Design an enzyme around this catalytic site. Structure first.
Site, PDB file in Angstrom:
ATOM      1  CG  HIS A 314      -2.121   0.921   0.914  1.00  0.00           C
ATOM      2  ND1 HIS A 314      -3.049   1.222   1.886  1.00  0.00           N
ATOM      3  CD2 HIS A 314      -2.537   1.547  -0.211  1.00  0.00           C
ATOM      4  CE1 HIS A 314      -3.988   1.995   1.372  1.00  0.00           C
ATOM      5  NE2 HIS A 314      -3.701   2.207   0.100  1.00  0.00           N
ATOM      6  CB  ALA A 315       0.340   4.253  -2.192  1.00  0.00           C
ATOM      7  CG  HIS A 344      -2.600  10.744  -2.747  1.00  0.00           C
ATOM      8  ND1 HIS A 344      -3.640  11.511  -2.268  1.00  0.00           N
ATOM      9  CD2 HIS A 344      -2.129  10.042  -1.689  1.00  0.00           C
ATOM     10  CE1 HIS A 344      -3.791  11.285  -0.975  1.00  0.00           C
ATOM     11  NE2 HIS A 344      -2.887  10.399  -0.600  1.00  0.00           N
ATOM     12  CD  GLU A 345       1.305   7.920  -1.245  1.00  0.00           C
ATOM     13  OE1 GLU A 345       2.053   8.349  -0.344  1.00  0.00           O
ATOM     14  OE2 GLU A 345       0.177   7.431  -1.020  1.00  0.00           O
ATOM     15  CG  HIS A 348       1.261  12.376   1.448  1.00  0.00           C
ATOM     16  ND1 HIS A 348       0.409  13.072   2.279  1.00  0.00           N
ATOM     17  CD2 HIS A 348       0.579  11.276   1.050  1.00  0.00           C
ATOM     18  CE1 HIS A 348      -0.735  12.418   2.382  1.00  0.00           C
ATOM     19  NE2 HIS A 348      -0.657  11.324   1.645  1.00  0.00           N
ATOM     20  CD  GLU A 372      -4.203  11.655   3.222  1.00  0.00           C
ATOM     21  OE1 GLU A 372      -4.301  10.995   2.167  1.00  0.00           O
ATOM     22  OE2 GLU A 372      -3.310  11.440   4.079  1.00  0.00           O
ATOM     23  CG  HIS A 473      -7.105   3.420   5.294  1.00  0.00           C
ATOM     24  ND1 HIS A 473      -7.270   2.827   4.059  1.00  0.00           N
ATOM     25  CD2 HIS A 473      -6.299   4.490   5.091  1.00  0.00           C
ATOM     26  CE1 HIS A 473      -6.581   3.499   3.155  1.00  0.00           C
ATOM     27  NE2 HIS A 473      -5.982   4.513   3.753  1.00  0.00           N
ATOM     28  CE1 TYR A 483      -7.279   7.887   4.253  1.00  0.00           C
ATOM     29  CE2 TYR A 483      -6.244   8.774   2.271  1.00  0.00           C
ATOM     30  CZ  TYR A 483      -6.179   8.011   3.425  1.00  0.00           C
ATOM     31  OH  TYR A 483      -5.034   7.343   3.756  1.00  0.00           O
TER      32      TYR A 483
HETATM   33  C1  LIG Z   1      -7.537   7.028  -1.073  1.00  0.00           C
HETATM   34  C2  LIG Z   1      -6.535   6.288  -0.204  1.00  0.00           C
HETATM   35  N1  LIG Z   1      -5.218   6.686  -0.811  1.00  0.00           N
HETATM   36  C3  LIG Z   1      -4.065   6.186  -0.205  1.00  0.00           C
HETATM   37  O1  LIG Z   1      -4.014   5.415   0.840  1.00  0.00           O
HETATM   38  O2  LIG Z   1      -3.003   6.622  -0.863  1.00  0.00           O
HETATM   39  C4  LIG Z   1      -7.014   4.820  -0.082  1.00  0.00           C
HETATM   40  O3  LIG Z   1      -6.158   3.983  -0.574  1.00  0.00           O
HETATM   41  O4  LIG Z   1      -8.038   4.218   0.374  1.00  0.00           O
HETATM   42 ZN   LIG Z   2      -2.421  10.035   1.528  1.00  0.00          ZN
END
Ligand SMILES: C[C@H](NC(=O)O)C(=O)O
Ligand SMILES: [Zn+2]
Ligand SMILES: *[C@@H]1O[C@H](CO)[C@@H](O)[C@H](O)[C@H]1NC(C)=O
Ligand SMILES: *[C@@H]1O[C@H](CO)[C@@H](O)[C@H](O)[C@H]1NC(C)=O
Ligand SMILES: [Cl-]
Ligand SMILES: [Cl-]
Length: 577
Positions: A314-315, A344-345, A348, A372, A473, A483
């Site tokens: 996971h990113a 997105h990353e 950050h 975010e 999460h 988010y």
């Molecule tokens: C939107 C969120 N993005 C993330 O973790 O980079 C997710 O994966 O549920």
């Molecule tokens: Zn994020």
């Protein structure tokens, strides 16, 4: 008082930088290489940091915060008084840290095996099945399978997890963990602010849901889709049905206007994970923003290793608290979806670099939502046909049909996500405050899944099922409501930046590429870190102080009109029971 506060903050800041940088490293080693050795060391490094936290946390608690004349010092000390997990007794702290590790390790190594010899993994396997398969039974196998594997496996942990994280929260002055997490926003009216926002985006979602439910009725058959009820959660193209852009093919408003296989486009021109991030890096610097250090390319893990390593795919982006070491850990796949996640990353990473000179205690976003949104804002411009064509991923451009098809593709991503991102923490805040016991975990998850998203589970759930744990999460204990806020305010930033860039015309046609005035606004705000309440940042960017869903409503406005006419002429009955 004052003289001694100032000094405490300085000492706390210089010791934290060291301790935190060591923790990061250990933590990084584990995430990118899941073994027993790296786990121990991580657990080891937990006790170290907890020790640092207890020494200064206790120190801090001896200061009367409301009687310090300096605002910057006063904010830091108050935050330091929150020991978080470190508030727990040695024993409960080690059990808690082991539970987090066990949960995150379980989720990251789970596989769903077949009768075809083959065990699939979340990325990219099971993800690819959910996005590309159009076979009810195949999607059902993956959807059910993943929950059978990951979901179920997280249940035995979670109740203890909830007990320990609430204790830690009460030990820091809060009523429970949800109360703790919600305070990150410093907004008493948060719960109601958000429910107003949610409600505002209701017509738009109900119209998308109904239009998509009709499309699915066309493709999977009347015997599987009730035009008046909820949609089977396994048919939206994404494991959790949080974004529905992967079924764009089954719902194209104007199929007479052909679609470029952007993925084939990227593969054909030889795009790689590295290329993607380089492109993301270029967009940021084009706005005048900071480029990622050379160290970043060295040390990051921009793709799933192939040396046998087991990792947390996971990113995520990483700050090593030294003002130079920033990395990203992503199992990047070559496609448009991940191209956006890469931005997105990178959003950050930019933030980390923007406020790296503030005291570590303030090295955070205005509020979780801001952190975010940054990358998503740029991604909004990257996703415009025009920009996509400039990357030679699309051919065009012009027509109202091509305009509505684009808005739909975006709606499947942005709008569909609103009710989900709202749901996740609605479930957890209730779990934390005790209104939902381990007896009703799943049932309540699906009550909310139905009420907010208009979704039903393709297979009736049974005892032992814990579908929430099938979402990253959850076992990873990462707050989700950030988010939701992100998706609302990113459009507010998009609209502000576009006005600054001199864009005129429909908001959805805006592309801030190379806008210096746009990067100037983002940077000034990102620079504030957590030094000030978030409304000031919201103000520096948009020129006012609040979250609002007007920007997002205005972007999609054209689509909303199209959807009403479309649904109306098919006599669609919006919403479910
Ligand atoms: C939107 C969120 N993005 C993330 O973790 O980079 C997710 O994966 O549920
Ligand atoms: Zn994020
Ligand atoms: C992963 O960790 C193990 C043990 O901690 C170590 O032997 C190995 O070198 C690491 N893998 C890589 C690729 O560095
Ligand atoms: C308080 O001190 C901090 C750190 O030295 C400084 O950043 C801030 O500007 C000072 N605040 C006020 C109000 O003087
Ligand atoms: Cl689910
Ligand atoms: Cl949050």
């Amino acid at each position: 008082d004052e003289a001694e506060a100032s000094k405490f903050v300085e000492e706390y800041d210089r010791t934290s930088q060291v301790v935190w940088n060591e923790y990061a490293e250990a933590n990084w080693n584990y995430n990118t290489n899941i073994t027993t050795e790296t786990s121990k060391i991580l657990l080891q490094k937990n006790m170290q940091i907890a020790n640092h936290t207890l020494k200064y946390g206790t120190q801090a608690r001896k200061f009367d915060v409301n009687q310090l004349q300096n605002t910057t010092i006063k904010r830091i000390i108050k935050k330091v008084q929150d020991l978080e997990r470190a508030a727990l007794p040695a024993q409960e702290l080690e059990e808690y840290n082991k539970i987090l590790l066990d949960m995150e390790t379980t989720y990251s190594v789970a596989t769903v095996c077949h009768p075809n010899g083959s065990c699939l993994q979340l990325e990219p396997d099971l993800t690819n099945v959910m996005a590309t398969s159009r076979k009810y039974e195949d999607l059902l196998w993956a959807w059910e399978g993943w929950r059978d594997k990951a979901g179920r496996a997280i249940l035995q942990f979670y109740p203890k997890y909830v007990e320990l994280i609430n204790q830690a929260a009460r030990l820091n002055g809060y009523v429970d963990a949800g109360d703790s997490w919600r305070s990150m926003y410093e907004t008493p009216s948060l719960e109601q602010d958000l429910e107003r926002l949610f409600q505002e985006l209701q017509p738009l979602y109900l119209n998308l849901h109904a239009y998509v439910r009709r499309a699915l009725h066309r493709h999977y058959g009347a015997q599987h889709i009730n035009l008046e009820g909820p949609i089977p959660a396994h048919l939206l193209g994404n494991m959790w049905a949080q974004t529905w852009s992967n079924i764009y093919d089954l719902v194209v408003p104007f199929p007479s206007a052909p679609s470029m296989d952007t993925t084939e486009a990227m593969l054909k021109q030889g795009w790689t994970p590295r290329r993607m991030f380089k492109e993301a890096d270029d967009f940021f610097t084009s706005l005048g923003l900071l480029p990622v250090p050379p160290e970043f390319w060295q040390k990051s893990m921009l793709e799933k290793p192939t040396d046998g390593r087991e990792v947390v795919c996971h990113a995520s982006a990483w700050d090593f608290y030294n003002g130079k070491d920033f990395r990203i850990k992503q199992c990047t796949t070559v496609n448009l979806e991940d191209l956006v996640v890469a931005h997105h990353e990178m959003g950050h990473i930019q933030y980390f670099m923007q406020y790296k000179d503030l005291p570590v205690a303030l090295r955070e976003g205005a509020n979780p939502g801001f952190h975010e949104a940054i990358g998503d804002v740029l991604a909004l411009s990257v996703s415009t046909p025009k920009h996509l064509h400039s990357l030679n991923l699309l051919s065009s451009g012009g027509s109202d049909e091509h305009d509505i098809n684009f808005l739909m593709k975006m709606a499947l991503d942005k709008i569909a996500f609103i009710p989900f991102s709202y749901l996740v923490d609605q479930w957890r805040w209730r779990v934390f405050d005790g209104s939902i016991t381990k007896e009703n975990y799943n049932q309540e998850w699906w009550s909310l899944r139905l009420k907010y998203q208009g979704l039903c589970p393709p297979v009736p759930r049974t005892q032992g099922d814990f579908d929430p744990g099938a979402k990253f999460h959850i076992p990873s204990s990462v707050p989700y409501i950030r988010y939701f806020v992100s998706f609302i305010i990113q459009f507010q930033f998009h609209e502000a930046l576009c006005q600054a860039a001199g864009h005129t015309g429909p908001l959805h046609k805006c592309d801030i590429y190379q806008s210096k005035e746009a990067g100037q606004r983002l940077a000034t705000a990102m620079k504030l870190g957590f030094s000030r309440p978030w409304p000031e940042a919201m103000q520096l960017i948009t020129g006012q102080p609040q979250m609002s869903a007007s920007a997002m409503l205005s972007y999609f406005k054209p689509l909303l009109d199209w959807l009403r006419t479309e649904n109306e002429l098919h006599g669609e009955k919006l919403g479910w029971p």
